[PDB]
A paper describes a structure:
The ferredoxin reductase FdR9 from Thermobifida fusca, a member of the oxygenase-coupled NADH-dependent ferredoxin reductase (FNR) family, catalyses electron transfer from NADH to its physiological electron acceptor ferredoxin. It forms part of a putative three-component cytochrome P450 monooxygenase system in T. fusca comprising CYP222A1 and the [3Fe–4S]-cluster ferredoxin Fdx8 as well as FdR9. It mediates the transfer of two electrons from NADH to an iron–sulfur cluster-containing ferredoxin via two successive one-electron transfer steps. The overall structure of FdR9 is similar to those of other members of the FNR family and is composed of an FAD-binding domain, an NAD-binding domain and a C-terminal domain.
Residue numbers in the entry: 1 to 393
Write the structure that this text describes.
Amino acid sequence: MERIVIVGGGLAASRTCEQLRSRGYEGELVMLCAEPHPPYDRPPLSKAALLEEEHDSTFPTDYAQLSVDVRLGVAATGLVPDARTVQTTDGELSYDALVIATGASPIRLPGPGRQFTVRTVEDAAQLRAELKPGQRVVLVGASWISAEVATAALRRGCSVTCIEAGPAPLSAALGADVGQRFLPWWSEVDLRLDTGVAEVTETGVQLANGEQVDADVVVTGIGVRPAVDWLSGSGIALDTGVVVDEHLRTSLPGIYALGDVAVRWSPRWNTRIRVEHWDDAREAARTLAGVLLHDPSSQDPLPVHDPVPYFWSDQFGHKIQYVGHHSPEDTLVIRGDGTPQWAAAWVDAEGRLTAHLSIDAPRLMIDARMAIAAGARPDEAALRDPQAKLAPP
Ligand SMILES: Cc1cc2nc3c(=O)[nH]c(=O)nc-3n(C[C@H](O)[C@H](O)[C@H](O)COP(=O)(O)OP(=O)(O)OC[C@H]3O[C@@H](n4cnc5c(N)ncnc54)[C@H](O)[C@@H]3O)c2cc1C
């Protein structure tokens, strides 16, 4: 029997298994999971897992009925493409095709003190146990994850401080103009802008000042880095992530990658995109399955993955929807400026809609997503009215 080996045990790995089976794959499937848990969903870790009574985010995938050999507590540590062999913490195994789906790891600060990052079920459970009335929580970075952790900490009675090097919350992701508009949402947080953090100390954090800010709990949310250090020396093309083409093929034949670990050339956006988004990992698994099962005698084209990216965040009681891929070079146009129903659009030098941000208004996002896909060039009157449809029929 042929053998496809999937390295990693999250959304991309689980969904690739389902897709490979639904689309006719009858060979062997082995999944190498570094974690000692069946794959589970991550968006809930900073949401339900902190706040709700029930929060088991394990996927419904039935690996017994899909004849998937799931190997828990086994991490890949090396790759020998010429031998079609992967090295792991539990020994060697060979493959006929290999899928890299190891996700990304949180960036952390230096220092000796206790420092939480949100990536596993253990992280969320131990962080939840520390979010209690009378606790001082310091969040490093005014990021999506920090905003979500801040929400849960406030609801559980914590004092929250958030230290951001940039000029406004979410400035790294959305820019200073848009981020500045979210300040009222942070009104219950001790938010310190334009402030760098040097390290996590035994008693809290130390600012670039050298000044200290005491804390009972420190949570760092300053981004993630693809988990690719095990690929060192394999000769695979890397660029802060595994480089794949629009068909999720790496630089080496028979080896594929998708999800948070992957950096993908996008014909649409004319650059490499490193978008750690739930929807992008999930959608890529369907494309990847189609690529792997492409009958060689068939003359059909090879499936492509180049969607308009989508991301959401649940914070401060609201729902933020973001679609597209804007550059700092793009022009920001606020929709409904001066009204509570405002949204944000970005257009390029040719007037083409590149991205759109809405709040509690998915109808606006859905229309914007199709407008971006179509390359729509809405006029100023349409952009300034939040309710105006931007997509062609
Ligand atoms: C707290 C949190 C909240 C989020 N909220 C949102 C949200 O609201 N909306 C949104 O769109 N996105 C959200 N995301 C992003 C989204 O969850 C990710 O894009 C998605 O999980 C990526 O799936 P993946 O399978 O590529 O990676 P992961 O889900 O990270 O899976 C990778 C798995 O492989 C394992 N692994 C790592 N190294 C190895 C190795 N060497 N060998 C074997 N296994 C290994 C990891 O332990 C992990 O189990 C959030 C992410 C986090 C962390």
